[PDB]
Symmetry: C3
Subunit: 650 residues, 3 copies
């Protein structure tokens, strides 16, 4: 089968294969995996465990696993994982040398030629977790590729107006280098197998998104994947907001996928002993929350790392969904309920389309690159540190999640700026500190054609060369109908108190003051102009150059950001989309459609039972899924702590 | 030459710091006050730098002057072999830099030992100051080559017998053999020129560096084992109010290493940290008394303070000294002098001390520390997921027992005698000893089968010596434990294990272990999960609780529940025959000893308040032999003041 | 000198002080925006600008010099009658914000020679050129010992010095070769830059701006720099250099930074080359945007401390990467922020009070707080570079004297802040003079003989913390034979480490002193002992010739710092001052937390500067000296009744005494 947007979603798990394991233990795993309503496994095709002393390939260890998978009707995601040190847990991200590249060619020839013949092979994973924060610039292969890339690019030290510039050669090379290696791996597989889906799992996306050109990857993939691990990738969130983290991670991959189907290649299946940055053992409740969040965001699968554990050194007896007796943990029991639900609701679950509110939260590579130059790699967890340009849009995302509104989370190049009408569409640019003339023209077009643009923090302070048009002649003056006057540093947390008394917005670190020309000024209680609304063609701009999303984050209170944002949304979004009648702290809802029927996903992450009033769209709430006996009266849902609910609208 | 033995009269002593610039008059002033302070012994760093002449010959003058003044005041000398090194190298190099350097060290030893062996007041050669370091010189050619050779001579496979991947810990096993080799080589060099004098060495920072030290091997070339036990360097795992427990554990660890050899504490902190030390202090007079008694009660044949007098330049200039800047007694030297005086007035008692072994042994192994260093990737976040949990865990059990007034051994697993036919009324505690191999598991099976009680908490036995988890592949301790692990689930740094029927609410650290029993009796918590078991195995028993409850005690700063639970598991004979407290006392310690058939107890109060301690077990009525704040007993109820040290003689 | 001077202004101690600003020139700026800057700068009562003469923005592909970009700026400055401080800033990476501190190589040195030849030969011809800044911000915490030029200079310096591993008595020593080389290396490079400029221009003032002075003072030999400078400068940035202080004490930080530069200047005039003019976005260690009130506070503090100028970094902002749209006094519309409006009031005040403002002499109380290079160097060796902000960390040797300085500021008393070599030990009379040596842990035999002479001739010496524990070779005479025994009439017994904050509980009168980290006990011979409640001797007063010594070897200045309370240190210090200081100097009748006063004289008239940094209106009773308070300057309507000044939060006041 070739995956499509109409495929039946699956629940699956990594089957960890290494020497020493017995036939009987491996059969025990596939048997329990099949009994757990899981259809799919993923296997790391370790070159180390196939290479013989003579340099031939012995496939025996993996044949045994593929044959047992086949016997239990389990399909396999096979990860290309060439020979590497036992201590290299995640795998090398690029060849070490030309000689190493040839060894990888030989690995792919042998492994793809052999395992392509199994009728239960579902997908090739080109590489595990492309991208690293520590790129191997010291190694000869990378050193040479970077030297060649620089020779083929012609950068000037000055812009057209004559101002000095940064060119971000390293960052632009790294995008092209990822594009090149993944495309090369896809071409290598395609030498031997044109039949099977090609897949890859970008990881740590709130940090590594600046490495990833998903639109290019679409050209050589059949599906986009992702590792979304609560213990590795969600450090910007408390555990009670891993719902929001998973929703944003799902939205980010969904945006990257474009017209391709996507699935989550890795979810955390088990316990951190010594591993992980933010260690946990997922609850049964978290397992259910993550699977539903992903399916509600169009995922065609959720694969857990891992069914069974590694036995030696790094992650030995960690991450596993099965216990040390090879029986179901409460996490596998939980995952099995979702597999069962899918088998009983195939037509619904196979045709999920996320109900787009029309709100898109946009991030760009360049804001992250400019931030890394300006903060000089500081990790003090504020606006003056690496991560503020992602924490800011994630904070708006959280505010909308706590309003029960869906929002896209997209790289700016993944947004379609080519349409003739953007009536009732919303773009949020939250502390996207780098914008160039081309994207500003796209934003002007978007707003002119009826779009609503919300911009906070230092959005557009710099261009793509770290040149500040705020200093030289502000590129967004036309769209904003206003001009920045000053930024003044304040405390980590201050209040922006609007003159009309309607709003007291938590704000982080810097207070922006502006001067309006065409825009309507918004004054604070100090008599300073802190924001404006510009009518621009059929659309509008709300600009508040203080970081109010980071303010919400620092105050741990998204309520004011919710209320303000709702007041700016086109009426059609609030009328046509199910959402909460007001802000609910630590509650999320996202809606989806399947074959003309609308559904809503609701999760309560508060310490108490909540009664959530759902308004907007049409229909009466029928509870289709609830793991703690939720009930609805009219469109008022009573939902318990850690409960996941699916409402079908009739 | 007088040879140290287990019957030697213990001494109080001090480093005499000799460097150029000192006058005859000031050095005589030191030896005179040292003798007047009831100290019999000094230690002198025999700096190669201060004997080498421009021509490369040896001029012994500076050290002759010190040895002759020591001799005049009847002071014996521990002479530390300390070849030429940079002025800024405070502690000394731990291995030769190069083959050429090794030959310079040979020449140093020839000259210094040939000359100073002739002094009748020479008591011992200290082969090297403070063997071992956290920063081992793998960068240097001598070490790099020895390591390459060692690896070639060892036959390591990347897979175990069952076929699983393994780690072989080549570096760690090499470092053990490398220390064994260099110290044995230094002993052989000294013995070329002097067969008469005791050979001694002072391992240091033992709660961190014990993984470098093979004490059973060192016994083959030593006459005595030493130690540096400095409150400002080595006790970072403890608050200052528990430096009693730290010193007791450090003494027990060296005593275990010593085996049949006598041991003494080569360095104790004698004075103030100005700029030096990790956990700086100036010991109180009360701490000086506490440390000397703890060491003597743990069979120490000496306590030598670093230092009598101070260095004058740069590192530790005017620091560490027992004398003040006028070269008169601080309250620390006055305090040490009372203990020297006590020894001279109680020779027969103080010369024949044997620690009263409760029969409780807390065991650590090199391999748990090595596997921890691989799994934590050197993280220093002070939890179970950091370097040091495998030592902090057993030290926490040690503290819980100290606060119950029970002695406990603190031993490397190879220092425990597993060869006996009977272990009735013996107890082994394996607290978060995360690495155990098949050989040690068979020894533990034998120990328990023959009547031993085994207490195991935290991740004990989660890995083998190759960092392979038999918990994953087929649990090697299933037979002994009569049970099988089910899961670990990470929780907060501090949570409560609430036993069914409210029998116990145990503080626990970081991970909750659940198990399944076969032969063992399960113990359930209030959530209906199986969190522990008792297995009857031959004549003995196993108590297994795979959650870290010793680290739980540490994190909660409360050892009371760990005390109560441990007491409930002890053979009756231990509680009947050993003096101990009738209940747990926070910040109080007691350890008992015997001399010539008479039993004694050492009690120290580290709480902020006067404590009334009810002592039970063993036989006899309290006679207070030593009490520096006028402690009094009513029956066997001891009223002891804050910071007081008490010795009871049981009549 | 007058024939050499030619048309060029020579700055002097009688010059009219100016307010000025950096004019940031880079390619891409338009003629129109640069003219807009000079026009607003002139309208803001500023007479002076400073310009970074970037080699990068003059070098052509062929290696010739194109001066066009800077010609445009100099001509627009000239049109608006603005004089220029021109900073020699050779070609360096765009990302090198502050500039290289030494040549990378012999080849680089030749490139610098060529840069200086071209730039000085050309811009010396502008009649509005006021000064050459030889280098921006000499000194760095990261000295380039890795680079071949520095490596070779260090090797040569070591060969030309003869150090023994042992002192005369035979004790081991440290020689601090690196630190002594670094002093001589700064002396050499700055002197070499001055010589290079003087090849082509003998007419214009030579200037330099040492920076981060509470950390980098150990790099700086100001007495030597005097031999090739016409004025000493300084960068004193609230966001970079004042980390040892909370923001509410940046008054004290600026006063101390001004005193430190004033001491370095000796007979030369000084001015503050950089003050923070605007906002930190991503830049700075302690980021802020100065208030209008802070701008006024800083200018008056500097002028009251004899500054002949205050130049703000920056009038306009950089446009790209580091500090893009940061530091600027103008807003993004190129109009006045409240900071430029504030600075303009001070420029206006100067124009209306030329004779007063041109002749300021600080009213020296006779209190000198002394620091030495060697205490900082010995501290760096003993703390092994630890940064835990206590006595056992880098910085205690400067935080201690700064704490005494703050105590005196909060008593309304002026105090000098001087390197020990900047103190004149040559006089016959030191009656009514006071030296404070606060945790100056390194003193040599030569300085001890100077201190003995100072006290014998009527000087009062106050010494706390580990003052004199070590000599200049990190050898402790406390261990070998205490070199200060004669002067102190006493001998140290012990140090015992305690908590970060403990109390010294005196025997008498239930008196208490906050103390930091270590308790010092002593034994008196000639001195009168002071005992604590434990019957230990914790301090003494030695009567020595006509003078006296107060010694308390516990850190009580650092105790005041840790407790955030300088009241007891104020009271104790006042009780030790010669009566003549309290009789002749305006000061507060008692300690005032978060208030400062410093007094100055101009043409025989006395003035006082008062700043309130408390959250509340304060009524400050001023006593000492003569005259009735007339309020000459007040930005929040201060009023005086007799000599009782009512001053509002963040207000700056100048009193003229009648
Ligand atoms: Cl994989
Ligand atoms: Cl020694
Ligand atoms: Cl400049």
């Amino acid at each position: 089968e070739r995956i499509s947007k109409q495929s039946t979603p699956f629940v699956g798990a990594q089957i960890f294969i290494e020497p020493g394991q017995t036939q009987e233990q491996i059969e025990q795993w596939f048997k329990l995996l099949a009994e757990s309503n899981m259809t799919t496994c993923r296997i790391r095709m370790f070159g180390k465990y196939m290479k013989t002393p003579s340099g031939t390939y012995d496939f025996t260890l993996f044949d045994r696993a593929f044959k047992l998978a086949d016997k239990y009707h389990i399909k396999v995601y096979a990860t290309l994982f060439p020979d590497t040190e036992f201590t290299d847990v995640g795998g090398f991200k690029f060849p070490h040398s030309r000689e190493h590249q040839k060894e990888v060619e030989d690995y792919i020839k042998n492994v793809v030629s052999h395992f392509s013949q199994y009728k239960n092979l579902a997908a090739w994973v080109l590489i595990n977790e492309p991208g690293t924060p520590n790129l191997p610039f010291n190694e000869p292969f990378t050193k040479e590729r970077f030297s060649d890339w620089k020779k083929e690019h012609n950068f000037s030290e000055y812009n057209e107006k004559g101002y000095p510039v940064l060119n971000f050669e390293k960052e632009n090379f790294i995008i092209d280098y990822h594009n090149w290696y993944l495309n090369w791996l896809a071409n290598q597989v395609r030498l031997y197998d044109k039949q099977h889906d090609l897949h890859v799992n970008p990881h740590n996306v709130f940090k590594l998104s600046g490495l990833y050109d998903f639109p290019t990857w679409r050209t050589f993939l059949n599906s986009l994947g992702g590792s979304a691990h609560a213990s590795w990738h969600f450090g910007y969130f408390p555990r009670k907001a891993y719902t929001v983290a998973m929703s944003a991670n799902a939205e980010l991959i969904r945006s990257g996928a474009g017209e391709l189907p996507w699935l989550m290649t890795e979810l955390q299946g088990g316990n951190n002993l010594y591993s992980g940055a933010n260690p946990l053992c997922p609850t049964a409740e978290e397992i259910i929350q993550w699977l539903w969040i992903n399916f509600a965001t169009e995922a065609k699968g959720g694969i857990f790392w891992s069914f069974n554990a590694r036995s030696t050194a790094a992650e030995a007896g960690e991450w596993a969904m099965i216990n040390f007796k090879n029986k179901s943990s409460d996490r596998l029991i939980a995952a099995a309920t979702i597999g069962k639900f899918i088998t009983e609701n195939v037509k619904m679950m196979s045709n999920i389309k996320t109900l787009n509110s029309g709100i898109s939260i946009l991030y760009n590579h360049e804001s992250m690159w400019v931030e890394a130059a300006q903060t000089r790699g500081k990790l003090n967890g504020n606006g003056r540190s690496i991560g503020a340009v992602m924490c800011s849009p994630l904070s708006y995302f959280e505010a909308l999640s706590e309003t029960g509104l869906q929002a896209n989370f997209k790289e700016i190049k993944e947004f379609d700026f080519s349409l003739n009408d953007y009536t009732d569409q919303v773009i949020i640019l939250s502390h996207q500190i780098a914008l160039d003339n081309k994207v500003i023209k796209q934003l002007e077009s978007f707003v002119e054609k009826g779009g609503t643009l919300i911009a906070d923090g230092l959005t557009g302070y710099y261009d793509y060369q770290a040149h500040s048009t705020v200093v030289s002649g502000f590129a967004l003056e036309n769209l904003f109908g206003s001009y920045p006057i000053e930024y003044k540093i304040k405390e980590n947390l201050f209040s922006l108190d609007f003159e009309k008394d309607n709003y007291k917005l938590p704000a982080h670190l810097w207070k922006g003051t502006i001067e309006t020309s065409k825009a309507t000024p918004i004054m604070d209680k100090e008599g300073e102009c802190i924001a404006c609304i510009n009518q621009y063609g059929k659309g509008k701009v709300f600009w508040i150059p203080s970081p109010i999303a980071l303010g919400a984050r620092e105050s741990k209170d998204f309520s004011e950001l919710s209320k303000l944002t709702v007041s700016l949304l086109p009426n059609k979004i609030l009328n046509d989309n199910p959402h909460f009648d007001k802000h609910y702290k630590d509650v999320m809802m996202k809606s989806f459609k399947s074959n003309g029927t609308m559904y809503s996903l609701i999760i309560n992450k508060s310490a108490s039972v909540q009664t959530v009033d759902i308004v907007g769209g049409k229909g009466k709430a029928f509870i289709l899924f609830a793991n703690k006996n939720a009930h609805s009266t009219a469109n008022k849902l009573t939902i318990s702590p850690e409960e996941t609910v699916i409402i079908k609208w009739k």
